[PDB]
Write a protein that binds this ligand. Structure first.
Ligand SMILES: CCCCCCCCCCCCCCCCCC(=O)OC[C@H](COP(=O)([O-])OCC(O)COP(=O)([O-])OC[C@@H](COC(=O)CCCCCCCCCCCCCCCCC)OC(=O)CCCCCCCCCCCCCCCCC)OC(=O)CCCCCCCCCCCCCCCCC
Ligand SMILES: CCCCCCCC/C=C/CCCCCCCCC(=O)O[C@H](COC(=O)CCCCCCC/C=C/CCCCCCCC)CO[C@@H]1O[C@H](CO)[C@H](O)[C@H](O[C@@H]2O[C@H](CO)[C@@H](O)[C@H](O)[C@H]2O)[C@H]1O
Ligand code: BCL
Ligand code: BCL
Ligand code: BCL
Ligand code: BCL
Ligand SMILES: CC[C@H]1c2cc3[nH]c4c(c3C)C(=O)[C@H](C(=O)OC)c4c3nc(cc4[nH]c(cc(n2)[C@@H]1C)c(C(C)=O)c4C)[C@@H](C)[C@@H]3CCC(=O)OC/C=C(\C)CCC[C@H](C)CCC[C@H](C)CCCC(C)C
Ligand SMILES: COC1=C(OC)C(=O)C(C/C=C(\C)CC/C=C(\C)CC/C=C(\C)CC/C=C(\C)CC/C=C(\C)CC/C=C(\C)CC/C=C(\C)CC/C=C(\C)CC/C=C(\C)CCC=C(C)C)=C(C)C1=O
Ligand SMILES: COC(C)(C)C/C=C/C(C)=C/C=C/C(C)=C/C=C/C(C)=C\C=C\C=C(C)\C=C\C=C(/C)CC/C=C(\C)CCC=C(C)C
Ligand SMILES: [Cl-]
Ligand SMILES: [Fe+3]
Lengths: 281, 238, 302
């Protein structure tokens, strides 16, 4: 149940709530007050998903789907069968996510390490809350949120996108995609670099971080370094999600027309607004 | 049809990949043990991978993993419950004993070398050409602990030569001796360097190095472990 | 507030590093460029030296030719007017030859011929750059991981503008060189093949794209959390495990039940990213050649 070097780290302390009440492990899992909390929220949430399944008349995972209240209900409560279950489950999901993050904070305190991990996770929580809470409340109805279903939630993405024409034209959406793409590029490189140094040509000795920097300078004339690339990966990732939340928070609120039309501000600038020729003239 | 064939065979490929990946990540820490250090009955579904050997550079030998795991040091801890899964309490001083957040690993008592075989980390005074090129120079600043008391003054910066980076600050104590402080655990301010993890009276306890011009991996671990441990154990003063 | 180590507090500089030698032809390395205090707050301050061999110059020349060829056409569509160029920069587009010309190189310049020219340069610029990433690693005696990972990105690229077009029978199926136009092409491609959300390889691809962001967020955050124990020195931690590696592993073990090793996490990383374009290329290759409509296919699975 313990890794060979684990015992010396399992000492008391670090908890944020309940002192030593929940300060223990179950197998490899650390519990803590928030471990108990997420179990509660998760169990309750799964139960309500099952109940929702019977009301729908199907136990098929690819068909189950909990929808939010219809627009008519605005931002108020709704009958379980018509959006109420979705509202409670959403409360549970949020409760489980936040509890999971605080549990990580306790694990950090016991291990004496930084809080960068739970901090980064909060950005994911934020993107989720933007879609099921912030945007809907700003738009006036829970109905704008997405449904909890494997394929139904993809339909929502599709319908929501096309509601504004080709969503590709959302400028914040463009920034976000760039970070997602760049992050994957960077992750592939980091993974490849460290491995090519630790696993050089057969028979040769392990390369050094010096060879890692040399390799990239030879290739593109610059090397960000071992500390910098971990900083970069953290930034590209958090930025991708930050701009994702941003491109949706402005859609349907400050801008509700076709996203492609937004680009007319640039083309209609006084100066070239009339110069004949080109594509727009 | 072709599409169906492609996707089914992809899931099989993916299953083999996860298997490979999980076993590769079992090259350290395994086999699992019971709290008393004996082999646990259930090791999980994945078997240990076949050993691999790394040829370390600069004639430092080889490393083969998985291999004999051993703490190679006494652990001042005792059980707090009659069953598995509970915390183990420090029998002595957790800071001095090196347990909990103050733990250190018994790494080789040699310094890390760069691609040329030279000590990777050296105090700046002994590093030709190196100088502070940006940001406040800490050398000369008084060092304050979490108890807002002055514990010493910075007399130098230990730098990573191949990566041109500051890694430690050498601090001189009231008694004329010095200690190293991890760069990541200090806050350089305009008129002082603040150390939140330790209280002034704990600086003397920071493990000392045997040579004044080099640090070994073993000493780095003891120093960093000790300082990080202050976050939990110094608390009654911070 | 405690130090987070996202930006350096103090910068330190020494003599420009000319790098390792091994079997590298030192004649082909340029000189060290200047030092950037700007970059130094985040990563290394040193710019250069860069290695420019034959393959390097070849790739760089092809690259610019591809870039310029598109540029010439963009100027041509703007009637050589500087104002128009800037105004409609995002709308210009070098479309491929019409369906009529099929897979031939007879199409006139003003109708795809120029597209073929540009594509030729890009094809040379990219593959020669691939050989470069392989040779630069060999000269240093390192594994060929970077070149193999790069091949994965090349796969999706090859499929989009070469493989699929050949199998379809015409260059008209390829992607046009244009900022907004290649976006429109992407939207159309989906509409025309049913809905791409029904393509199982597309969904897997998204899985890995999302996963790459999740993993790098996890990995980057972990290393910074244990940098107070020298965690970023990943190679030495692989050779002689320190408390940074143990704490990193235990954080994840206590959180989700299992963990990785300092070397292992990088194997997870290289694959999570590589699979994005690997499954992606497969999904695109099968579209229009074997499967006309993913919705329909999804109803039968064959
Ligand atoms: C159609 C598809 C066409 C698409 C083409 C795109 C190709 C994409 C290539 C991606 C490569 C990424 C691989 C990363 C990597 O490890 O690279 C280094 C690796 C070693 O580099 P090195 O410098 O020579 O060695 C350094 C050290 O000596 C040694 O260093 P090392 O220890 O790091 O390397 C050892 C490495 C060796 O690497 C390999 O062996 C690579 C394997 C190639 C995979 C190719 C993917 C094919 C996609 C299949 C999907 C199906 C769809 C239909 O081991 C692995 O990574 C293990 C791979 C796990 C395979 C799992 C197989 C499961 C089979 C199922 C069994 C049944 C299950 C029971 C239930 O490179 C390769 O092995 C090259 C692969 C190139 C193949 C090109 C294909 C020609 C076309
Ligand atoms: C000491 C002892 C240590 C001993 C044993 C340790 C056990 C290690 C298990 C390691 C597993 C592991 O890494 O598994 C993964 C996949 O999980 C799930 O499917 C689904 C969700 C379930 C999570 C299950 C988590 C396991 C918790 C383990 C507890 C064990 C401890 C008990 C003692 C993770 O991450 C996967 O990496 C793969 C990359 O090659 C693959 O793509 C997979 O992919 C998903 O396919 C979905 C199909 O619909 C797709 O829509 C989705 O987009 C994909 O991401 C990813 O989830
Ligand atoms: C994957 C499916 C589509 C596609 C869909 C999209 C979508 C959707 C978007 C882009 C966007 C971009 N695409 Mg694209 N793109 C495709 C194929 C390509 C190819 C190629 C050689 O095949 C290239 C060079 C590009 C290049 C680009 C960039 C100009 C721009 C993203 C910035 C970025 O972070 O880049 C990463 C590279 C670097 C940081 C290094 C330089 N695409 C295929 C055909 N592309 C984004 C944009 O802002 O467009 C205007 C955007 O939203
Ligand atoms: C046809 C439809 C439109 C379109 C419509 C939309 C719409 C509509 C939306 C996006 C959004 C996104 N689009 Mg789009 N998009 C299109 C085309 C593209 C193309 C392309 C190459 O063509 C690309 C690259 C993208 C890319 C993207 C991403 C930038 C972004 C989603 C990532 C995200 O928010 O993560 C954020 C991550 C999360 C929300 C997850 C949070 C995870 C939570 C906290 C934890 C869950 C735990 C789980 C329950 C636990 C399980 C336990 C088990 C034990 C494992 N789009 C087309 C043109 N796109 C979305 C966005 O920006 O959202 C903010 C969005 O709403
Ligand atoms: C970000 C913009 C859209 C969106 C757009 C898309 C698009 C577009 C696609 C998906 C796809 C998926 N989405 Mg989504 N998705 C959104 C929000 C969510 C939320 C949430 C809590 O907000 C969740 C749990 C999911 C979950 C999922 C997965 C079922 C599936 C992706 C696997 C994956 O690799 O993910 C990345 C994460 C990992 C690799 C980590 C491991 C996590 C595992 C895979 C989670 C499994 C969850 C399980 C199936 C659900 C358990 C719920 C029970 C109640 C406990 N999405 C928002 C609203 N999603 C893909 C698919 O194939 O769908 C059918 C796909 O193409
Ligand atoms: C309306 C349009 C459709 C759609 C149509 C498509 C289509 C069509 C394609 C994708 C593809 C992808 N889509 Mg989509 N997609 C939609 C909606 C989504 C949503 C969402 C939340 O709604 C998401 C997350 C995604 C996500 C994704 C990615 C997983 C995937 C591309 C991976 C990649 O890295 O490419 C970028 C990486 C490359 C192109 C690699 C090649 C790069 C080359 C080698 C570099 C050249 C460099 C050049 C020479 C140098 C430039 C540098 C200079 C300095 C300038 N799509 C909607 C429903 N999507 C692609 C795929 O693989 O699908 C299976 C694809 O073809
Ligand atoms: C797992 C797949 C992911 C991935 C991986 C990946 N990409 C890679 C690699 C890998 C493993 C490399 O090794 C390779 C690399 O070398 O990276 C640093 C690369 C690379 N990925 C690149 C791009 C890229 N990757 C992308 C994506 C991805 N790459 C995926 C997410 C995308 C997207 C999202 O569309 C793009 C645009 C390239 C930057 C680079 C390969 C370089 C190349 O092929 O170059 C040929 C050379 C040219 C085209 C030169 C001309 C450039 C400009 C047009 C001119 C202006 C600049 C010039 C310097 C001016 C000179 C002026 C003179 C007066 C001096
Ligand atoms: C270098 O350093 C590093 C390490 O170490 C050396 C690491 O390991 C890791 C991370 C570790 C890995 C092994 C990478 C693996 C790859 C992934 C893609 C992981 C992400 C995907 C998953 C599917 C993870 C599964 C997720 C979860 C949340 C499983 C949880 C399972 C349960 C049964 C829930 C438990 C529930 C509760 C409530 C806990 C309390 C328990 C009670 C009984 C009460 C990183 C990033 C790292 O950088
Ligand atoms: C300031 O003005 C000057 C003139 C100096 C320069 C200006 C230049 C400008 C403004 C350039 C703008 C270019 C842009 C915006 C280009 C954008 C391209 C994009 C967005 C995407 C590219 C997609 C292309 C991929 C899919 C292409 C793949 C191509 C291939 C796989 C090669 C296929 C090969 C062919 C057809 C023939 C070669 C033959 C053989 C077998 C050897
Ligand atoms: Cl030399
Ligand atoms: Fe790393």
């Amino acid at each position: 149940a313990l890794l060979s070097f684990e015992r010396k780290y399992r000492v008391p302390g670090g908890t944020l709530v309940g002192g030593n009440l929940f300060d223990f492990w179950v197998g490899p899992f650390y519990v803590g007050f928030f471990g108990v909390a997420t179990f509660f929220f998760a169990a309750l949430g799964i139960i309500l998903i099952a109940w929702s399944a019977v009301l729908q008349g199907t136990w098929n995972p690819q068909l189950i789907s909990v929808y939010p209240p219809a627009l008519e209900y605005g931002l108020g409560g709704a009958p379980l069968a018509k959006g109420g279950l979705w509202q409670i489950i959403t409360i549970c999901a949020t409760g489980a996510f936040v509890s999971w993050a605080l549990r990580e904070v306790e694990i950090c305190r016991k291990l004496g390490i930084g809080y960068h991990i739970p901090f980064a996770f909060a950005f994911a929580i934020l993107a989720y809350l933007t879609l099921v809470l912030f945007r809907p409340v700003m738009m006036g109805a829970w109905g704008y949120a997405f449904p909890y279903g494997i394929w139904t939630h993809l339909d929502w993405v599709s319908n929501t996108g096309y509601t504004y024409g080709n969503f590709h034209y959302n400028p914040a959406h463009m920034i976000a995609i760039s970070f997602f793409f760049t992050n994957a590029l960077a992750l592939a490189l980091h993974g490849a670099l460290v491995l090519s140094a630790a696993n050089p040509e057969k028979g040769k000795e392990m390369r050094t971080p010096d060879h890692e920097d040399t390799f990239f300078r030879d290739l593109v004339g610059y090397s960000i370094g071992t500390l910098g690339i971990h900083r970069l990966g953290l930034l590209l990732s958090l930025s991708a999600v930050f701009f994702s939340a941003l491109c949706m928070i402005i859609t349907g609120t400050i801008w509700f027309d076709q996203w492609v039309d937004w680009w007319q501000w640039w083309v209609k600038l006084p100066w070239w607004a009339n110069i004949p020729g080109g594509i727009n003239g | 049809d072709l599409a169906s064939l492609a996707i089914y065979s992809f899931w099989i490929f993916l299953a083999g990949l996860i298997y490979y990946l999980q076993t590769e990540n079992m090259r350290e820490g395994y086999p699992l043990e019971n709290e008393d250090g004996t082999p646990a009955a259930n090791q999980g579904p994945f078997p240990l991978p076949k050993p691999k050997t790394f040829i370390l550079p600069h004639g430092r030998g080889t490393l083969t993993v998985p291999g004999p795991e051993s703490e190679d040091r006494p652990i001042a801890l005792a059980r707090t419950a009659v069953s598995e899964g509970f915390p183990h309490a420090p029998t002595g001083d957790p800071m001095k004993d090196g347990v909990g957040p103050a733990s250190w690993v018994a790494r080789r008592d040699l310094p890390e070398l760069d691609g040329h075989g030279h000590n990777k980390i050296k105090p700046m005074k002994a590093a030709a050409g190196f100088h502070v090129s940006a940001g406040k120079n800490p050398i000369g600043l008084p060092v304050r602990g979490c108890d807002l008391e002055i514990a010493g003054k910075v007399v130098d910066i230990w730098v990573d030569i191949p990566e041109q980076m500051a890694r430690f600050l050498e601090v001189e104590l009231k008694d004329g001796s010095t200690r190293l402080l991890p760069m990541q655990m200090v806050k350089v301010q305009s008129n002082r360097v603040h150390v939140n993890a330790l209280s002034s009276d704990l600086f003397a306890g920071i493990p000392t190095i045997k040579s004044p011009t080099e640090v070994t991996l073993l000493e780095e671990d003891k120093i960093c472990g000790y300082v990080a441990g202050g976050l939990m154990y110094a608390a009654p003063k911070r | 507030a405690e130090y987070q180590n996202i930006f350096s507090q103090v910068q330190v500089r020494g003599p420009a590093d000319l790098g390792m030698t091994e079997d590298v032809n030192l004649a082909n390395r340029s000189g060290v460029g200047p030092f950037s205090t700007l970059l130094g707050w985040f990563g290394n301050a040193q710019l250069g030296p860069i290695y420019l061999g034959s393959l390097g110059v070849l790739s760089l020349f092809s690259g610019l030719m591809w870039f310029f060829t598109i540029g010439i056409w963009f100027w041509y569509q703007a009637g050589w007017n500087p104002a128009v160029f800037l105004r409609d920069l995002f709308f210009f587009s070098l479309e491929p030859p019409a369906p009529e010309y099929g897979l031939s190189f007879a199409a006139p310049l003003k109708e795809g011929g120029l597209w073929l020219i540009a594509s030729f340069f890009m094809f040379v610029a990219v593959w020669s750059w691939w050989g470069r990433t392989y040779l630069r690693a060999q000269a240093l005696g390192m594994g060929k991981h970077t070149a193999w990972a790069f091949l994965s990105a090349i796969w999706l690229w090859m499929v989009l503008g070469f493989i699929r077009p050949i199998l379809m029978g015409s260059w008209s199926e390829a992607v046009p060189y244009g900022i907004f136009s290649h976006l429109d092409w992407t939207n159309n491609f989906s509409l025309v093949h049913g809905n791409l959300f029904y393509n199982p390889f597309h969904g897997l691809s998204i899985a890995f794209l999302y996963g790459s962001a999740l993993l790098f967020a996890m990995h980057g955050a972990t290393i910074l959390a244990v940098s107070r124990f020298g965690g970023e020195r990943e190679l030495e931690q692989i050779a002689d495990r320190g408390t940074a590696a143990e704490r990193a592993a235990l954080f994840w073990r206590w959180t989700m039940g299992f963990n990785a090793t300092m070397e292992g996490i990088h194997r997870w990383a290289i694959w999570m990213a590589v699979l994005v374009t690997l499954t992606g290329g497969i999904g695109i290759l099968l579209s229009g050649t074997v499967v006309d409509n993913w919705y329909v296919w999804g109803q039968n699975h064959g």
